[PDB]
Design a protein around this ligand. Structure first.
Ligand SMILES: Cc1nc(=O)[nH]c(C(=O)O)c1C
Length: 160
């Protein structure tokens, strides 16, 4: 039975069948999650550019990297940013389904340098849930903060 789990570690060391990159729309290597991803799976950045609110899979060997582009909330209104964030997660769900994978490693999109300086843990996690609730894959959420791990864990626990 599929589950949601949270791990506080480098997503580049995930034990899932595919990874989601928190990507930029230019398909460029970048910093944070995206940098680690680039180091681990650099061939996945071939033609990886995709618009904000979309996701595009590029294979690294047979390992799928799903580049998902959350909005930078510095640029977007709260209303349009929210719509874009929901959309990116929805595209991730589609790619996960098309690939036939049993599990996916996912970061919370638009919660770091794209957060517009705002705490968006709940906003981002809820969009992730909405999208992935229609899939049969085990989901492992990767974060880096000690707290966020607790709050994500609590949020998972309370739906069961
Ligand atoms: C490049 C990038 N894309 C995202 O979807 N989210 C984030 C984020 O704020 O984590 C970044 C930095």
């Amino acid at each position: 039975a599929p589950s949601y789990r949270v791990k506080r570690m480098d997503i580049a060391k995930n034990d899932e069948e595919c990874v989601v990159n928190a990507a930029n729309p230019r398909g460029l290597p970048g910093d944070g999650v995206c940098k680690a991803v680039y180091k681990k799976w650099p061939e996945s950045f071939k033609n990886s550019a995709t618009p904000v609110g979309t996701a595009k899979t590029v294979m690294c060997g047979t390992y799928p990297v799903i580049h998902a582009v959350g909005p930078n909330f510095s640029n977007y209104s709260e209303s349009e940013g929210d719509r874009e964030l929901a959309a990116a997660y929805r595209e991730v769900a589609k790619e996960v389904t098309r690939l036939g994978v049993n599990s996916v490693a996912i970061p919370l999109l638009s919660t770091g340098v794209y957060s517009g300086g705002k705490d968006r843990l709940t906003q981002s996690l809820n969009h992730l849930f909405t999208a992935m609730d229609s899939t049969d894959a085990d989901v492992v959420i990767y974060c880096r903060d000690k707290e966020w791990e607790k709050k994500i864990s609590e949020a998972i626990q309370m739906r069961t």
